[PDB]
Amino acid sequence: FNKITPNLAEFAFSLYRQLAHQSNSTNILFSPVSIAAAFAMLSLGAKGDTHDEILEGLNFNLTEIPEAQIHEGFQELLHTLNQPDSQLQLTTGNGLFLSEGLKLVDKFLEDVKKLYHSEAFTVNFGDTEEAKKQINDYVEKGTQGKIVDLVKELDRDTVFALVNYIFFKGKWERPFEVKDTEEEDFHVDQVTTVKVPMMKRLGMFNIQHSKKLSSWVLLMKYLGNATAIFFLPDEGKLQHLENELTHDIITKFLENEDRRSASLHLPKLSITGTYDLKSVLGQLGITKVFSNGADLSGVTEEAPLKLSKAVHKAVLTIDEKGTEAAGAMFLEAIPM
C-alpha cells in the first residue's frame, strides 16, 4: 500500500503557489513528477545539510517518512507509471551524464539505477558542442518530438548533468465534437480578448461547485485511468483558488464520481513552459545545493562539484480529441 503521493501534490502546490505570487497575468505550467524525481534521484548522492534542504524542501519531511519509502516509494511510482495500457500513453525516463570512468561512488551508481532505473551516459564535457545536443537528443526521443532542444548553453567546466523526460497522450473517453467546436472569444482580462477554437459539449459531467475552493471543478477523464481536473474560480474570486488548493480537498474530488448533466465549453490549448529553478527552488528552501556547502559526497568522491542551475520544461495540448502533454528537467553540476 505505497504512496508518498500526497507529499508530491503539496509540492505541486508549494511550488505553483509560488509562481502565482510572482506574476498574475502569465500562463503557469510545470510538472511535479518530472522535477521532484530529479532532486530525489540527486538525493541518493546528497548528504547532510544539503540532502536535508533539498528534501523536506519539497514537503517530503524527514522526521515523518524514512528515506527508504521516499525512495522505494518512487521506484514503484515510476515503475508502475512507465508501464501503462493501450488507450493511454504515460512514459517517463531518467538519465544522468558524467565523464567516463568517473569518480562515481560505487554505492550511488547502483541506487539511482535500481531505485529509478536511470541511465548512465558518460558525456565528454570538453567540447560542449557535443554535450548540449546529445543530451537534448535523448528527451526528444521520448517526448516523441515534443522537446528536441531542452538545452542551449552549459558550462564547459560542468562536472555533471542530470536529466529526465516525460511524455503523455490521453484521450477523453467522452470526446468533444470537432464540429460543435465554435470560434469564440476568450475573455482574457478586463479589456483584452483573443480568439480561440472553443470546444463544446452538453450532457452529464462530474463538474461540481464547492465553497472552500470556490470554483467549478470539472474532472473529465481518459482511456487508461487518468483524470484532468479543471478549476473555475469565481468572478474575481481567483486568488482564492490558487491559495486554496490542497491535497486534502482534491483527494475528496477524485472520489466524487456523482454526475449532473450540464453544458461545457473548453477552448483548444497549446502553451509552453520554461524556467530556471535556480531561484524558485531556493525561495522554496533549496539554495543549500546551490551554495558553498555542496555536499555531493554520494554523487562523487573525486572533487566537490555543485548545483549550477535548474532547467525545467513542459508542453500541454487540449482539443476535442484529448490531451497530449510532455515535459522535462535538466541539472548541472560544476566544481568549487
Binding site: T5, I229, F230, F231, L254, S263, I271, A314, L316
Partner: peptide
C-alpha cells in the same frame, strides 16, 4: 448548469493508479 471555461483558471492532469500529479498549470491569456 450552464458552465463555460473562457477566462484564466487552473487545470491539473492526474494518474489514477498512482494518484500522481503528472502536470499542472493555469491558463490565463491563450
Amino acid at each position: 448548469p450552464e458552465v463555460k471555461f473562457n477566462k484564466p483558471f487552473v487545470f491539473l492532469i492526474i494518474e489514477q493508479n498512482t494518484k500522481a500529479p503528472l502536470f499542472m498549470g493555469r491558463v490565463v491569456n491563450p
